Write a protein that binds this ligand. Structure first.
Ligand SMILES: O[C@@H]1[C@@H](O)[C@H](O[C@@H]2CO[C@@H](O[C@@H]3CO[C@@H](O[C@@H]4CO[C@@H](O)[C@H](O)[C@H]4O)[C@H](O)[C@H]3O)[C@H](O)[C@H]2O)OC[C@H]1O
Ligand SMILES: O[C@@H]1[C@@H](O)[C@H](O[C@@H]2CO[C@@H](O[C@@H]3CO[C@@H](O[C@@H]4CO[C@@H](O)[C@H](O)[C@H]4O)[C@H](O)[C@H]3O)[C@H](O)[C@H]2O)OC[C@H]1O
Ligand SMILES: OC[C@H]1O[C@@H](O[C@H]2[C@H](O)[C@@H](O)[C@H](O)O[C@@H]2CO)[C@H](O)[C@@H](O)[C@H]1O
Ligand SMILES: OC[C@H]1O[C@@H](O[C@H]2[C@H](O)[C@@H](O)[C@H](O)O[C@@H]2CO)[C@H](O)[C@@H](O)[C@H]1O
Ligand SMILES: *[C@@H]1O[C@H](CO)[C@@H](O)[C@H](O)[C@H]1NC(C)=O
Ligand SMILES: *[C@@H]1O[C@H](CO)[C@@H](O)[C@H](O)[C@H]1NC(C)=O
Ligand SMILES: [Co+2]
Ligand SMILES: [Co+2]
Ligand SMILES: [Co+2]
Lengths: 434, 434
């Protein structure tokens, strides 16, 4: 796609700290951009929609190539249309925003410049952020994570994409998502099937795959930390059901691991660690600090700080595994005890280390779940299982929770606030911000 | 040996913090006891010495059994004879103390009660302490470490030892030391050879072996962190040169690893990390906090705090190893690049995990080195090597430094102060002390 300018594109600014081993941190100035899927897609030479509701213009978009030539992405009114605001080092995303039309949530990338994404090499480093999840009920997910996207959003590889990172192109993740309207500088109109339950979305014949570090998927009830390896580390197109992922019939018939080696303290048996109010170790009615460390072995360590008190990731015992570090032994034990082979089939932490050794883009988002109502995060899943199934219970939410239309109607003012991002060598981010 | 009471035994008290995962710490009250080797050893029924200078009484001690029956250990005047004092959570050890006779240094164990050692299970936990090494020049070693000693100092196994932990019996370490005057409830007079350079010591026909976690061996110039595995985890007698260790002809012909997998930041190439004055990352003229974490994988992590600034163990690159965690890959790479096979021959971190999974006793000591002048810690070693030999340079001290008689004459008022010991689950010790 190209870019159009009927609405100007001004990325909300966002600062963050880069810390060094010598013990100081210095402020960096970036900004955030909204993913292309949220944008208005229209004819280059008029305001005629190329995509409307959940269907494509059959005339402007008779095939993927013609569609990309005919169509452009336009700018975003971040606050009024999308409910996205920033203030210094803080970013807030509102759940449902009513303007001329209703918008649901947002997916945002941190930029290095107006036209390029910020890339982070996670390996040997740590990433710290503060979050307020108090306004996230059952069925919502305020997510902070990393994906192996190109810094230009795909322009160098696919010159029919001239919109680039400035317009949030180039997304990929470990679900090999097929709901993207543009992949590899072409539309995804070929094979398009509108969602049966979502007025704004569909599934196309192509998907976009890459490695994913799910640092934080969470609401006020549950939180999970999950690496997802792929056999191709970086962004790669996939064809139809060969994609695997949430958007395909065959979840496991692709190049990525859509399940991941997840660590959810509630799932692992500590139901007292994280939740709303003073009966939990971390009180989710209040802001908390989350720190994630990527040691060179490829294991992941985690601690939290709230009101000046530090807590490592709680210990878990699973099969022969015991401890609080997300390592090979944990992931192998998880598969043994909870089931599945996707994470190991895709090469486990060894393959995942190839992603964190390279550059990844930071994503912050707020979403509800049209496929599974977020039950995999905060409820019992599958819903016919009981607590006697190992790993079935992931949170306290009812198995009836998270129906998108219901949560959008009942909790439109839900929101997430991410703030005080700090990045540097392991051990460095607790030092004073510059 | 038995105990005698011509001098009363009052262990200097010492408090420390036990921290919990829930984020609080509570004060514990223990005390310190001096190792039996430092004590006066005399006939049970008089003040006649069983051991004097570096030789044994041939009449009281004609063999190991008769000697133990005839002889007792007596109490210690901690301050006036040994230069050992405590105040709340602080312990100080002076280098040379002149009373009726000259004493050099001390080795001390933390007690649970007047008659038992405190045991710590290191695995899954972390140990924090503060240290002032400002008064430790080249050739001195203020050491804090753990060994797999019996809590009773050997009494249950060896009933001819009735003195026990109260009198500091039962020592063992990864050098399988043969300088101990009592091992396994018998004397070590058989095979005794007085030291050629030490008026107060010798080497006997028996040694005492066990696993050793050298958390801290350091002076103002260099510091090292070193696990040492043994094929028998706990305390075990050894016979003569079959002992291996510093005190034998054949260093590597025993059940313990006397070299260990050592991590010395200077040795590994960061000569700027630790030293006297503001040109170093950690200024050794001032107190610093040292934290050591024993993750369940069996790897060891380390960070430091000084004036509120936190530093992870500095990154090192060695062969194919890169990072700051002391793990299998580090230790294997060290052997490959610096030489040796002792650590791996004795089972590496896997065998060492058997020690940290069990109970270990905390040892604090101050010593000079009659075998190697501490050059392995703070100088170039062996001394004929140059900087072009990988790992030869371990510190900035001259290869002429650390001659015991010289340092005892020039720096008698050298001292070490250990304080603010805190122990608990990984992530817990930075929380407020109770
Ligand atoms: O000036 C007018 C434009 O503002 C207007 O723009 C519309 C803006 O909203 C667009 O709809 C977006 C599409 O994305 C939705 O989010 C999905 C959430 O689930 C994800 O899996 C998926 O990938 C996302 O696509 C978002 O909720 C929704 O609001 C709409 O298509 C634009 O046309 O157009 C008309 C102009 O007059
Ligand atoms: O009342 C008098 C007693 O106080 C007196 O006791 C003497 C106290 O000092 C004893 O000598 C100790 C022996 O240990 C030395 O340390 C060695 C350091 O290197 C280590 O490897 C080794 O294992 C340690 O043994 C310490 O420096 C030295 O002072 C002496 O033997 C006692 O007899 O006895 C006479 C009473 O009248
Ligand atoms: O709704 C898709 C969701 O699945 C998670 O993986 C689940 C998996 O679907 C389920 O079969 C298993 O029992 O639990 C897994 C972990 O919660 C993914 O982690 C998530 O990214 C989504 O893809
Ligand atoms: O003086 C004995 C001392 O040796 C250390 O191990 C040395 C070893 O002696 C040397 O050959 C090698 O080059 O360096 C090693 C590490 O410094 C031990 O660590 C120490 O405990 C002592 O036993
Ligand atoms: C030494 O280590 C410190 C702490 O990690 C680091 O800040 C410094 O840059 C290192 N210097 C060198 C020269 O290796
Ligand atoms: C849950 O984790 C916290 C933090 O480690 C710990 O303090 C608490 O005891 C744990 N509780 C249970 C019931 O597992
Ligand atoms: Co195709
Ligand atoms: Co680790
Ligand atoms: Co014997």
């Amino acid at each position: 796609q190209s870019a159009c300018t009927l609405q100007s594109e001004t990325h909300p600014p966002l600062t963050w700290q880069k810390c060094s081993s010598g013990g100081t941190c210095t402020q960096q100035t970036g900004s955030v951009v909204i993913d292309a899927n949220w944008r208005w897609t229209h004819a280059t030479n008029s305001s005629t929609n190329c995509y409307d509701g959940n269907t494509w213009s059959s005339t402007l978009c008779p095939d993927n190539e013609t569609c990309a030539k005919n169509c452009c992405l336009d700018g975003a009114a971040y606050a009024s249309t999308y409910g996205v605001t920033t203030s210094g080092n803080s970013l807030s995303i509102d759940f449902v925003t009513q303007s001329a039309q209703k918008n649901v949530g947002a997916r945002l990338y941190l930029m290095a410049s107006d036209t390029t994404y910020q890339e982070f090499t996670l390996l040997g480093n740590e990433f710290s952020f503060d979050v307020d999840v108090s306004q996230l009920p059952c069925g919502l997910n305020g997510a902070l994570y990393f994906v192996s996207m190109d810094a230009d959003g795909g322009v160098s590889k696919y010159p029919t994409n001239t919109a680039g990172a400035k317009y949030g192109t180039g997304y990929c993740d470990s679900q090999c998502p097929r709901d993207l309207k543009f992949i590899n500088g072409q539309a995804n109109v070929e094979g398009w099937e509108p969602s049966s339950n979502n007025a704004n979305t569909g599934i196309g014949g192509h998907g976009s795959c890459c490695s994913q570090m799910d640092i934080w998927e969470a609401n006020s009830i549950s939180e999970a930390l999950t690496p997802h390896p792929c056999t191709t580390v970086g962004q790669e197109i996939c064809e139809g059901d060969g994609c695997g992922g949430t958007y395909s019939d065959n979840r496991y018939g692709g190049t990525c691991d859509p399940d991941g080696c997840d660590w959810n303290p509630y799932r692992l048996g500590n139901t007292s660690f994280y939740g709303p109010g003073s009966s939990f170790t971390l009180d989710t009615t209040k802001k908390l600090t989350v720190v994630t460390q990527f040691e060179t072995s490829g294991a992941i360590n985690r601690y939290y700080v709230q009101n000046g008190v530090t807590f490592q990731q709680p210990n878990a015992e699973l099969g022969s595994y015991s401890g609080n570090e997300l390592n090979d032994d944990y992931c192998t034990a998880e598969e043994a005890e909870f089931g599945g082979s996707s994470f190991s089939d895709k090469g486990g932490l060894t393959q995942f280390k190839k992603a964190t050794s390279g550059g990844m883009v930071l994503v912050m988002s707020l979403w509800d779940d049209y496929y599974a109502n977020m039950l995999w995060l905060d409820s019992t899943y599958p819903t016919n299982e009981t607590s006697s199934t190992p790993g079935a219970v992931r949170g306290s939410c009812s198995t009836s929770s998270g129906v998108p239309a219901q949560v959008e109607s009942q909790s439109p003012n839900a929101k997430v606030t991410f703030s005080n991002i700090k990045f540097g060598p392991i051990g460095s981010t607790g030092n004073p911000s510059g």
